[PDB]
């Protein structure tokens, strides 16, 4: 009664809102279209445009479900509005629902306008995203399977060789990289290769050789590390450090010690039931000491000092 001609009031809000979509602030444009809808005039083309325009505002705002609903209401008035099918398709695409995106664009392509360029582009974009996700899936899943194949083959190898691995709370930073493998990583009968902490406790110095084959003997590893002239051994008894004059010792699972025989391989040492000589942090830990200082150093070995280096 205060004011009427609601069809022109609806077009007032419609034309007023279209200048704001050109102006780019969408939340104000969006609400201006809503008031044209609230008038509820008996006119199809006005209401169709209001629903299609508000859907466009919701797409720019990135409210994708609300965009689909305003497109649906526009298509109830005009089911051959190709603009609304593009927006439903793009909205579904952005929600990672590619089948719902393809269905809408396929309906527009097959049954409304095959020549429409925005619908064809959306088809090609849906097509690419479908198969790029496939290439991503069949890369992720093969690599997880390959990772798992390497891990089972390594555990089988270590269980077969009777190797116990006792982890410690404080490994020095060279060990924490973690380098243990098979030569043929799919054949668990090929050589297991592990790193080695070589301890010289009398001098307070250590070597870290990154890769030692299991079939390597104790003598051969001792020959390699002591070959060069030692700049390192400043403390007492430096002259005794030669392959002929040193002895090699290793920690047991109980916490004590065993003299590692120079003829023996690391394979045969780790495999033995008694005494059980394990790895520490997936690596060897040997103690090279002079032959003359071994008697005093073995007595010094504290059993609980070593027992409480361990994690659990
Ligand atoms: Mg053993």
Curated annotation (Swiss-Prot):
Any single biological process term in GO: protein refolding
Repeat positions for TPR: 10-43, 48-81, 82-116
Keywords linked to the UniProt accession: Chaperone, Cytoplasm, Repeat, TPR repeat
Keyword Repeat in annotation: yes
Predominant place of localization: cytoplasm
Source superkingdom: Eukaryota
Entry GO MF terms: Hsp70 protein binding; Hsp90 protein binding; ribosome binding
GO cellular component: cytoplasm; nucleus
Compartments, as annotated in UniProt: Cytoplasm
Annotated consequence of substituting residue 187 to G: In CNS1-3; temperature-sensitive defect impairing Hsp90-dependent function
Induction comment from the UniProt entry of this chain: Not induced by heat shock.
Record note on what altering residue 257 to S does: In CNS1-3; temperature-sensitive defect impairing Hsp90-dependent function
Keyword set includes Oxidoreductase: no
Extra information: Present with 672 molecules/cell in log phase SD medium.
Role this protein plays: Co-chaperone that binds to the molecular chaperones Hsp90 (HSC82 and HSP82) and Hsp70 (SSA1). Stimulates SSA1 ATPase activity, but not Hsp90 ATPase activity. Involved in only a subset of Hsp90 functions.
Similarity comment text for this entry: Belongs to the TTC4 family.
Oligomer status and interactors: Monomer. Component of Hsp70 and Hsp90 chaperone complexes. Interacts (via TPR repeats) with HSC82 and HSP82 (via C-terminal MEEVD pentapeptide). Interacts with CPR7, SSA1 and SPI1.
Name this polypeptide is given: Hsp70/Hsp90 co-chaperone CNS1
Native species: Saccharomyces cerevisiae (strain ATCC 204508 / S288c) (Baker's yeast)
């Amino acid at each position: 009664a205060y004011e009427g001609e609601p069809h022109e009031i609806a077009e007032n809000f419609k034309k007023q809102g279209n200048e704001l979509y050109k102006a780019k602030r969408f939340k104000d444009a969006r609400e201006l279209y809503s008031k044209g809808l609230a008038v509820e005039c008996e006119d199809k083309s006005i209401n169709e445009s209001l629903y299609a325009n508000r859907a466009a505002c919701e797409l720019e705002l990135k409210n994708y479900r609300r965009c689909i609903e305003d497109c649906s209401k526009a298509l109830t008035i005009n089911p051959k509005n190709v603009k609304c099918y593009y927006r439903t398709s793009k909205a579904f695409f952005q929600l990672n629902k590619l089948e719902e995106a393809k269905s809408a664009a396929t309906f527009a392509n097959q049954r409304i306008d095959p020549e429409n360029k925005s619908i064809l582009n959306m088809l090609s974009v849906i097509d690419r995203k479908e198969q790029e996700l496939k290439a991503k899936e069949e890369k992720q899943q093969r690599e997880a399977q390959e990772r798992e194949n390497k891990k089972i083959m390594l555990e089988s190898a270590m269980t077969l060789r009777n190797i116990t691995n006792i982890k410690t709370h404080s490994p020095v930073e060279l060990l924490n990289e973690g380098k243990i493998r098979l030569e043929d990583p799919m054949d668990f009968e090929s050589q297991l290769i592990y790193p080695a902490l070589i301890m010289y406790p009398t001098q307070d110095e250590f070597d870290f050789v990154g890769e030692v084959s299991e079939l390597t003997t104790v003598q051969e590893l001792v020959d390699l590390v002591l070959e060069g002239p030692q700049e390192r051994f400043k403390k007492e008894g430096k002259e005794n450090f030669t392959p002929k004059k040193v002895l090699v010792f290793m920690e047991t699972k109980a916490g004590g010690l065993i003299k590692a025989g120079k003829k023996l391989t690391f394979h045969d040492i780790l495999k033995k039931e008694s005494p059980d000589v394990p790895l520490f942090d997936n690596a060897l830990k040997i103690y090279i000491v002079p032959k003359v200082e071994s008697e005093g150093w073995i007595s010094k070995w504290d059993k609980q000092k070593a027992l409480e280096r361990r994690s659990v």
